[PDB]
Amino acid sequence: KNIDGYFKIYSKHTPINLVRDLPQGFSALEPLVDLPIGINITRFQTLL
Amino acid sequence: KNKCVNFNFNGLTGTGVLTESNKKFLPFQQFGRDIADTTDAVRDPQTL
Numbered sequence: 001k002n003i004d005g006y007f008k009i010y011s012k013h014t015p016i017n018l019v020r021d022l023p024q025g026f027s028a029l030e031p032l033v034d035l036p037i038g039i040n041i042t043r044f045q046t047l048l
Numbered sequence: 049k050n051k052c053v054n055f056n057f058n059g060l061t062g063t064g065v066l067t068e069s070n071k072k073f074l075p076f077q078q079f080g081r082d083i084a085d086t087t088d089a090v091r092d093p094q095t096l
């Protein structure tokens with residue numbers, strides 16, 4: 001999320017045993033970085 | 049430690065008795081708060 005041009009990243013890695021979808025359960029995402037880029041971002045894309 | 053002192057951490061000024069804590073701060077976490085929005089535990093800017 002980009003709040004006032006600061007790129008905050010919250011990340012979390014958990015194991016699962018499934019191939020279908022997002023599992024039922026609860027887990028929180030610890031903050032990772034702040035990138036003070038100041039960029040208006042409106043579209044994105046992932047890279048495989 | 050164990051003495052009532054005027055402590056100043058990164059501008060987080062106050063007065064209290066700094067003791068050894070058994071809280072488990074996450075690596076990013078810097079300081080704690082009390083229900084009254086007052087600091088209860090801090091991370092020393094020099095010694096983590």
Ligand SMILES: *[C@@H]1O[C@H](CO)[C@@H](O)[C@H](O)[C@H]1NC(C)=O
Pocket residue numbers: 093094095096
């Ligand atoms: C400087 O701060 C770092 C932060 O962890 C600490 O490891 C180091 O011992 C400090 N050195 C001096 C000379 O204050």
